[PDB]
């Protein structure tokens, strides 16, 4: 039903962000390798770009499937017009917050790389910047999982109000 | 003090469910209704969280030196683009998990700190929305069993 | 479905270039159902880009596109995009990515790259995505899913 539509969409979108955060942390660790060829640095950037693009494509895939399931429920008469409206707004909100999380993770990765390059110093400064990136990326992933549960929970309570 | 008392009641309950006594680390009936509804909502929130994402406490990075940032960075991102009751439940549940994880790692000193940080964030940044949306009694009407 | 796939790439890139004020005809000398497909893809591309504009200029900037390096940059990113499978969202992301590379190419007065990127994109679509597309009901599935 409608509750599974929203849950599935939220879980997929949040899981794509958790996975992106993990991929970026692993790529930042590889960038810490100290006999890194350029040959590899170029491949690290390419993997970064593909991870960002994959995450946002997969988030959008989950949202588009969910909106199609929502409209099928409207047609089969398993949801009225006001419930469908609440579900579509929740899905738009999910797309907005998950797409923001992906852009933030990408920007923090780009800042980390720069601090690693430009901010020059012992491993200590640099390995600090790694552990900072991992700390920030995990915070974003956690916050998004919490918003995902909370928004679907509140959607269900909105449907009951209706 | 009502918001402080909600934080303490909720944390005391979540800590008790994970094996710990709040006493180790630190209207009357209308307040019970709000406390009970929030306990039940946090229980349901945590069930949903575990079914989708598995364990919450072990995924929380926290040391005494980074604890304020662990709390602040998550909470600021959670409410970055708005507030609803479900995200307020998430905020309590997150705070409860951060306290359990702190105790699990022998960082008991952080429980009272986190409770204070939660009460301050409720009073300064969520109370306007809460009161505008009917106060905690409306939360009970919507979430209480 | 090969010629239709080239027309799709040309239509989408011409649209994205025109959104930045640039004219396809300067870079290249190149019914109802094809129009529905083109329109759904333009709209999905707009929606994808809506909340990724100035930060997906960033990605393309990070790749430091040049005529000598663009092909490997494009192909490596696309290969990683689809490394573990295909879905319609990734295909939209593929079109949008190639659109962003064309716009970046013109911005940097590397216009020769526009028709090359279109060729690489059409080749990839026909060789590596068309089998999945056909097993998923064809582009009409995409028109229905997007709306």
UniProtKB/Swiss-Prot annotation, chain B:
Motif position, BH4: 2-22
Disulfide bridge positions per record: none
UniProt keyword terms in alphabetical order: Apoptosis, Cytoplasm, Cytoplasmic vesicle, Cytoskeleton, Endocytosis, Membrane, Mitochondrion, Mitochondrion inner membrane, Mitochondrion outer membrane, Nucleus, Phosphoprotein, Synapse, Transmembrane, Transmembrane helix, Ubl conjugation
Record's comment on post-translational modification: Proteolytically cleaved by caspases during apoptosis. The cleaved protein, lacking the BH4 motif, has pro-apoptotic activity. This phosphorylation is partial in normal mitotic cells, but complete in G2-arrested cells upon DNA-damage, thus promoting subsequent apoptosis probably by triggering caspases-mediated proteolysis. Phosphorylated by PLK3, leading to regulate the G2 checkpoint and progression to cytokinesis during mitosis.
Subunit note: Homodimer. Interacts with BCL2L11. Interacts with BAD. Interacts with PGAM5. Interacts with HEBP2. Interacts with p53/TP53 and BBC3; interaction with BBC3 disrupts the interaction with p53/TP53. Interacts with ATP5F1A and ATP5F1B; the interactions mediate the association of isoform Bcl-X(L) with the mitochondrial membrane ATP synthase F(1)F(0) ATP synthase. Interacts with VDAC1. Interacts with BCL2L11 (via BH3). Interacts with RNF183. Interacts with GIMAP3/IAN4 and GIMAP5/IAN5.
Family assignment from sequence similarity: Belongs to the Bcl-2 family.
Protein name in the entry: Bcl-2-like protein 1
Source organism (scientific name): Homo sapiens (Human)
Residues of the full protein shown: 3 to 197 of 233
From Swiss-Prot, chain C:
Keywords recorded for this protein, A-Z: Apoptosis, Cytoplasm, Cytoplasmic vesicle, Cytoskeleton, Endocytosis, Membrane, Mitochondrion, Mitochondrion inner membrane, Mitochondrion outer membrane, Nucleus, Phosphoprotein, Synapse, Transmembrane, Transmembrane helix, Ubl conjugation
Motif (BH1): 80-99
Residue window of motif BH3: 37-51
A molecular function GO annotation: protein kinase binding
Name recorded for this polypeptide: Bcl-2-like protein 1
Domain notes: The BH4 motif is required for anti-apoptotic activity. The BH1 and BH2 motifs are required for both heterodimerization with other Bcl-2 family members and for repression of cell death. The loop between motifs BH4 and BH3 is required for the interaction with NLRP1.
Tissue specificity statement from the Swiss-Prot or TrEMBL entry: Bcl-X(S) is expressed at high levels in cells that undergo a high rate of turnover, such as developing lymphocytes. In contrast, Bcl-X(L) is found in tissues containing long-lived postmitotic cells, such as adult brain.
Native source species: Homo sapiens
BP GO annotations: apoptotic mitochondrial changes; apoptotic process in bone marrow cell; cellular response to alkaloid; cellular response to amino acid stimulus; cellular response to gamma radiation; defense response to virus; dendritic cell apoptotic process; dendritic cell proliferation
Post-translational modification: Proteolytically cleaved by caspases during apoptosis. The cleaved protein, lacking the BH4 motif, has pro-apoptotic activity.
Motif (BH4): 4-24
Outcome after substituting residue 99 to E: No heterodimerization with BAX
